[PDB]
Each structure stands twice: as C-alpha cells, then as structure tokens.
Amino acid sequence: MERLLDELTLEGVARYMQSERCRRVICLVGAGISTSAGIPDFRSPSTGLYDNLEKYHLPYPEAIFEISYFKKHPEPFFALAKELYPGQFKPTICHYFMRLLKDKGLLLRCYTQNIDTLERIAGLEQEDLVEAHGTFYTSHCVSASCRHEYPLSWMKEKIFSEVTPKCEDCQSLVKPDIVFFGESLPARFFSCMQSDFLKVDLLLVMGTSLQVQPFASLISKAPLSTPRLLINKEKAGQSDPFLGMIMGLGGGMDFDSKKAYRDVAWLGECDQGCLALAELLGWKKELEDLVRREHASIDAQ
Amino acid sequence: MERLLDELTLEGVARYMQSERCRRVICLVGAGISTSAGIPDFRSPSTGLYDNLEKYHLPYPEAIFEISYFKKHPEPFFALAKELYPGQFKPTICHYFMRLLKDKGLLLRCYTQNIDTLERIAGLEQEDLVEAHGTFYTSHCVSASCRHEYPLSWMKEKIFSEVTPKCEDCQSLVKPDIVFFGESLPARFFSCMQSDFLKVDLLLVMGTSLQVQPFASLISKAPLSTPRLLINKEKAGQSDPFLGMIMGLGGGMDFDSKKAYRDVAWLGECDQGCLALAELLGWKKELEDLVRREHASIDAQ
Ligand SMILES: Nc1ncnc2c1ncn2[C@@H]1O[C@H](COP(=O)(O)OP(=O)(O)OC[C@H]2O[C@H](O)[C@H](O)[C@@H]2O)[C@@H](O)[C@H]1O
Ligand SMILES: Nc1ncnc2c1ncn2[C@@H]1O[C@H](COP(=O)(O)OP(=O)(O)OC[C@H]2O[C@H](O)[C@H](O)[C@@H]2O)[C@@H](O)[C@H]1O
Ligand SMILES: NC(=O)c1cccnc1
Ligand code: NA
Ligand SMILES: [Zn+2]
Numbered sequence: 247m248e249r250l251l252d253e254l255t256l257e258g259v260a261r262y263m264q265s266e267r268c269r270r271v272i273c274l275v276g277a278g279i280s281t282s283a284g285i286p287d288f289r290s291p292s293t294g295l296y297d298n299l300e301k302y303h304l305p306y307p308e309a310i311f312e313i314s315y316f317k318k319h320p321e322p323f324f325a326l327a328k329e330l331y332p333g334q335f336k337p338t339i340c341h342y343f344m345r346l347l348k349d350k351g352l353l354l355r356c357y358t359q360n361i362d363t364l365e366r367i368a369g370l371e372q373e374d375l376v377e378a379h380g381t382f383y384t385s386h387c388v389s390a391s392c393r394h395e396y397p398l399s400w401m402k403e404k405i406f407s408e409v410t411p412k413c414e415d416c417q418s419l420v421k422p423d424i425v426f427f428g429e430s431l432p433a434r435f436f437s438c439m440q441s442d443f444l445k446v447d448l449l450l451v452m453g454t455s456l457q458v459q460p461f462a463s464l465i466s467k468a469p470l471s472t473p474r475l476l477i478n479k480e481k482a483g484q485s486d487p488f489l490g491m492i493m494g495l496g497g498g499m500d501f502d503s504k505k506a507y508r509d510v511a512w513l514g515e516c517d518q519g520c521l522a523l524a525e526l527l528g529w530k531k532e533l534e535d536l537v538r539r540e541h542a543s544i545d546a547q
Numbered sequence: 548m549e550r551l552l553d554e555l556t557l558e559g560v561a562r563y564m565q566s567e568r569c570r571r572v573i574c575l576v577g578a579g580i581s582t583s584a585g586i587p588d589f590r591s592p593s594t595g596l597y598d599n600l601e602k603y604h605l606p607y608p609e610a611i612f613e614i615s616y617f618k619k620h621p622e623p624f625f626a627l628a629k630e631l632y633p634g635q636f637k638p639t640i641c642h643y644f645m646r647l648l649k650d651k652g653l654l655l656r657c658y659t660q661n662i663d664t665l666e667r668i669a670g671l672e673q674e675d676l677v678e679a680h681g682t683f684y685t686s687h688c689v690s691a692s693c694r695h696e697y698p699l700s701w702m703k704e705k706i707f708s709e710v711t712p713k714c715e716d717c718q719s720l721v722k723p724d725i726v727f728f729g730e731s732l733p734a735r736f737f738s739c740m741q742s743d744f745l746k747v748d749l750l751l752v753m754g755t756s757l758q759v760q761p762f763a764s765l766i767s768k769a770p771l772s773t774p775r776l777l778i779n780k781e782k783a784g785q786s787d788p789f790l791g792m793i794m795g796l797g798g799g800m801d802f803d804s805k806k807a808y809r810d811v812a813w814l815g816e817c818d819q820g821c822l823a824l825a826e827l828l829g830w831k832k833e834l835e836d837l838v839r840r841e842h843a844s845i846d847a848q
C-alpha cells in the first residue's frame with residue numbers, strides 16, 4: 247500500500263497535489279456544489295427539493311424522478327420541470343475551481359450528477375465532463391422500439407404551454423434526457439469510467455450525499471492508493487452498514503477509523519473549501535479573479 | 548480472472564464440483580427457496596408479500612419492516628407477525644440439498660436472508676448458518692441504552708394476546724431480532740463474511756432477487772475465479788446499470804456478455820434445479836430418500 251498523503255488534512259492533500267505524483271484529478275460532484283448559486287439540493291432537510299414536493303401528493307418524493315411512476319403520472323414532473331431549465335444561475339467558486347484544474351492540466355474528468363449545466367457555463371468542455379445523470383438539452387420518446395429524438399425547443403414549447411409532450415411517431419410520453427430512477431445512464435459514463443479510474447491520482451468529491459447508485463460506486467473504482475478528498479457540509483460515504491444501505495459493503499470512505507489512510511473530509515461550504523484549498527496551492531487570487539471576470543462576462547451577454 | 552468451469556452450464560458446474568479443487572461451497576439463499584413449502588416471497592408480482600399489504604395502509608410496502616416507521620406505528624408489523632412465526636411449513640428439496648452439502652463435507656456456510664428457520668429444520672446447525680436478516684428465536688428491547696432480551700415465548704404471549712410488546716425495564720418497544728430496514732445486521736454476518744470468502748471455491752445462489760444490501764454485496768466478496776451458480780426463476784444480479792440499482796457497479800453477475808467466464812444461471816424452480824444438480828453428481832436417490840424420511844419424521848411429530 248502506497249501511502250500518498252503525508253497526513254489526512256486539506257494541507258496534506260494540497261502538498262500531494264503540488265507533487266509530481268499528482269497528475270490526474272477526477273472530480274465527483276453533486277447538487278451541493280450549486281446551492282450557493284441559488285439551486286436547492288435534493289436531500290438537505292427542509293430546504294432540499296425532496297422536502298418541498300407536498301403539493302404534488304406523491305407517494306414518496308423520489309416518485310417525481312422515477313420512470314415507472316412517470317409513465318403512470320407524468321403531470322407532476324412536467325409541472326416541476328418549468329423550474330428545472332438552466333440560465334437564471336451563475337456558476338460558483340467551486341465550479342471555477344474545477345475550471346482552474348482544467349487550465350492547469352490536472353483535470354482528467356469531472357463526473358457530475360447535476361443537470362443545471364453550470365460546469366459547461368463555467369467553461370469545462372464536453373470532453374472534460376461526464377454528465378452522469380443526463381441532460382435537459384435533448385429529449386427522447388420513452389418507447390424502446392421508437393426512441394425518436396426531440397430538441398430543446400420542442401420540449402420547452404411543450405413544458406411552458408403545459409401540453410404533456412407525446413411522441414409524434416408512437417404517441418408515447420416524451421421526456422428530457424435527465425436520468426430517472428430505473429433508467430440507464432448515458433453510455434459515455436461507463437466508457438469513460440472504465441479508462442479514467444485506472445489512472446486517477448486524486449478524487450475530489452464535492453457536494454454529494456453519495457446516496458444513489460451507480461454514481462456512489464465510483465469512489466470504489468479508484469485504485470486503493472488514490473487519496474480521496476471530500477468537500478461537503480456533512481460526512482458522506484462513511485457509514486456503518488445496515489439493511490438498505492446504498493453503498494456496497496466496504497465500498498465507502500474511511501475518514502475516521504484506525505485504518506484510515508487516504509480519505510479526508512473537509513466539512514463546510516464547497517465554495518469555502520475550494521477557496522481554502524486554492525489558498526494552500528497558491529491559486530487563490532487567480533481563482534477570485536476568474537470568478538470576478540467570468541461573472542462580469544455573463545452579465546454582459 | 549482465471550476460468551475454472553469448462554463450460555458455463557449446470558453440467559460444467561457439476562464437473563467442477565467433482566474436481567479436487569471444489570472443497571468449500573457457500574450458499575446464498577432467499578425467500579425463493581421457501582415458496583414451494585407454502586411461504587410467499589417478498590417481491591414476486593401478485594403473490595409476494597409486498598404486493599399484499601394494502602389493508603395496513605402503508606406509505607410503501609417496505610415500511611412494515613422499516614425501523615423508524617415501526618417505532619411510530621408498530622401495530623401493522625405485529626398484526627402481520629402472526630403469519631410470520633416459523634413452524635407450520637416443512638423444508639423443501641432445496642433445503643435438503645444443502646443438508647447433503649453439509650453431510651458430504653462441502654458446505655462451508657449457508658448465508659440466508661430468510662427468517663423461516665427451514666434451514667435449521669432441514670438439519671443445518673448454528674455453525675453452518677449465517678441468519679443474515681436475523682431470527683424470531685430471540686427478541687430485544689429497541690432502546691440502545693437498555694437492550695433487554697426476551698425469549699420466544701414472551702414475544703409470542705405478547706404477539707398472540709395482541710398487546711404491543713413493551714420492555715419491562717424501560718418501556719421501549721420490544722422487537723423480534725429480525726433485521727428491519729435501517730438496522731444493523733448481526734455481528735456474526737460480518738465476522739463470518741471476513742473469513743468465509745477468502746477461500747470459497749463455489750457460490751450457490753438460490754431463490755433471491757439480490758435486491759437488498761449488504762447481502763447483495765456478498766457475491767462480489769468471493770475471489771474472482773470462484774464460479775457462481777444461480778438457481779432461480781429469473782436472472783438476478785445481472786443488469787445494465789441504471790439509476791437506483793442495488794448492486795454496486797460491476798459488483799453483479801455476468802451470465803451473458805462475451806466476457807462471461809464463471810457465472811451460470813439455471814432458471815426454474817429451486818427444487819428442480821437442485822434435483823437436476825443432484826442427478827449429475829449421482830446424489831439424486833440419496834436426496835429423494837432424505838426428503839421423504841424427513842417429511843415423514845415431521846409428519847410424525
Ligand atoms: N453549499 C454546500 N457546500 C457543501 N456541501 C453542501 C452544500 N449544499 C449542500 N451540501 C451537501 O451536498 C449534498 C447534496 O446531496 P443530495 O442533495 O443528495 O444531492 P446529490 O447530487 O448527492 O444527489 C444525487 C442524485 O439524487 C437525486 O435523485 C438526483 O438523481 C441527483 O442527481 C448533501 O450532502 C448536502 O449536505
Ligand atoms: N420456487 C422458486 N424457485 C426458484 N426461484 C423462485 C421461487 N420462488 C420465488 N423465486 C424467485 O426468488 C426470488 C425472491 O426474491 P425476493 O422475494 O426479493 O426475496 P429475497 O429473499 O431476495 O428478499 C431479500 C430481503 O428483502 C426483504 O425486504 C427481506 O428483508 C428479505 O430478506 C425472486 O427472484 C423470485 O423470482
Ligand atoms: N443542481 C441540479 O442539477 C439540480 C437539479 C434539480 C434539482 N436540484 C438540483
Ligand atoms: Na453543477
Ligand atoms: Zn415514439
């Protein structure tokens with residue numbers, strides 16, 4: 247076992263990142279990286295989306311993003327979907343920190359569970375990204391025998407006119423290519439995962455509860471020696487086993503046991519943790535300038 | 548990734564089982580092995596328990612075995628629990644096939660998700676068994692500061708008098724030691740798993756949909772060369788990944804891809820699968836005689 251972190255702290259991760267041994271970083275992110283932009287997450291008590299769906303009278307909150315429920319009752323999704331489209335929000339410091347990794351030749355990939363497109367808006371390119379839970383950008387008829395594609399405009403025209411979008415070929419429901427419970431993830435997820443996780447030197451895990459598979463499996467795909475830094479409000483991925491746990495057995499993070507050797511939890515807001523890390527790396531001013539600049543460009547156009 | 552089976556069929560598995568190399572077999576079983584005895588499973592459409600709880604007016608079927616739901620509403624579980632006490636049923640051909648494994652010195656362990664006790668009734672002893680999802684035999688006070696134990700008869704008195712079991716010391720609920728969603732599994736599950744899977748030569752997986760963690764992780768604990776035979780009505784543990792899948796990524800079975808090298812799916816009744824296997828091993832007659840005698844002995848008592 248190569249012990250790559252000289253200590254299990256942000257400072258130790260930063261020293262590692264500056265070494266020659268840290269060539270390729272994979273970011274794994276979720277909704278907590280966009281809450282500072284004004285987008286609520288899913289599972290935060292009271293504020294998260296799943297605590298705010300009472301008006302839809304769902305059997306349980308996740309039903310609104312579940313394919314089998316959606317086929318029986320598509321209306322609640324499509325009413326909610328008016329709010330989901332991007333462009334009223336700017337990327338956060340955390341998004342720009344990932345941009346900085348790209349520009350420093352350190353970003354192997356950002357795997358995102360989010361559909362707000364803020365990674366792209368912050369300037370990560372298509373090849374840098376795996377939008378693991380899909381995209382609002384395109385839509386598809388739900389029938390396996392048809393799968394006719396529809397573009398954003400056709401879906402928007404339907405979403406904002408409150409017309410439940412039906413496919414013109416087979417009259418089956420049509421939906422944005424956001425991944426619902428029960429649906430296949432994009433092929434790109436699996437093909438990038440296969441090669442990426444053979445060669446990652448650091449995993450940065452930000453703003454995710456790690457409560458859904460297969461995304462939560464990604465942390466167990468890195469080599470055993472690859473350090474893993476979590477920047478998040480709460481410890482995630484570290485949990486005693488129990489019946490119904492999400493993670494596979496032994497598949498989680500070990501921050502606190504007597505055997506912990508490579509996992510670090512920095513607890514706080516993602517923006518603050520990225521500033522803190524950037525400071526340690528000597529990038530803080532560069533990062534603040536990038537944010538200031540890019541926020542200004544956005545306000546222009 | 549070493550290939551031990553000469554072909555990916557029940558015949559190949561039988562031959563491997565006859566080789567010198569097959570010394571230690573672990574069985575991983577669920578409720579499908581007890582349906583032919585008259586005990587419904589959980590997840591089969593129409594017949595399974597989860598499709599038959601309407602009268603309890605549950606938010607979702609699993610709530611009846613969910614620890615936080617239980618504490619708030621214990622009445623539905625205790626009403627259902629009359630049907631649940633083990634006794635009226637006899638072990639199946641499958642259970643006796645495992646008895647034969649024990650008596651031929653091949654059975655390293657049977658890991659069961661069932662609480663029906665049929666494995667013990669068929670003659671498996673405590674040491675051969677990991678009752679992964681607990682047992683009715685003992686009951687405990689739910690309060691973690693107290694943990695008073697109550698014997699079966701005390702729980703039955705309470706069950707059948709239709710008073711909700713209360714701890715005599717601290718007045719918290721008392722619960723049979725079956726594992727609910729959100730509860731930890733028995734300590735034995737983990738201690739046995741740590742050592743059992745180091746040198747197992749064959750996994751036999753029978754009568755389970757592999758839809759619950761951490762039990763579902765067990766198949767991935769075996770070394771990569773250990774073959775795995777599924778005897779089940781349907782394929783389980785093989786899927787394209789999808790959002791909300793139970794298995795961690797690549798932690799499942801691969802019966803059908805072109806990389807398939809060690810997993811075999813025999814689809815049908817567990818009883819029939821075990822008879823077909825017994826036949827190919829030359830144990831068919833011994834199995835049938837054991838079943839008849841044992842059924843005869845139970846009828847007698
Ligand atoms: N500003 C912040 N800084 C740091 N951590 C934060 C912040 N805001 C929230 N958190 C933490 O951020 C985490 C947010 O966790 P979840 O809300 O489950 O979002 P996901 O992206 O993991 O959800 C994954 C999928 O589940 C859905 O079904 C969709 O399919 C999603 O794609 C929590 O630990 C918060 O404490
Ligand atoms: N006679 C049969 N022969 C062969 N296969 C069968 C038969 N009967 C049913 N099957 C298959 O047997 C499987 C039954 O699968 P599930 O009903 O999910 O039972 P589990 O033991 O895996 O449930 C695990 C836990 O979930 C609960 O919450 C409790 O915690 C349980 O302990 C299916 O694939 C059937 O097609
Ligand atoms: N940031 C996001 O992708 C998102 C989408 C829907 C709900 N909450 C968060
Ligand atoms: Na984002
Ligand atoms: Zn169609």
Ligand SMILES: [Zn+2]
Pocket residue numbers: 688689690693694695714715716717718719
């Ligand atoms: Zn007590």
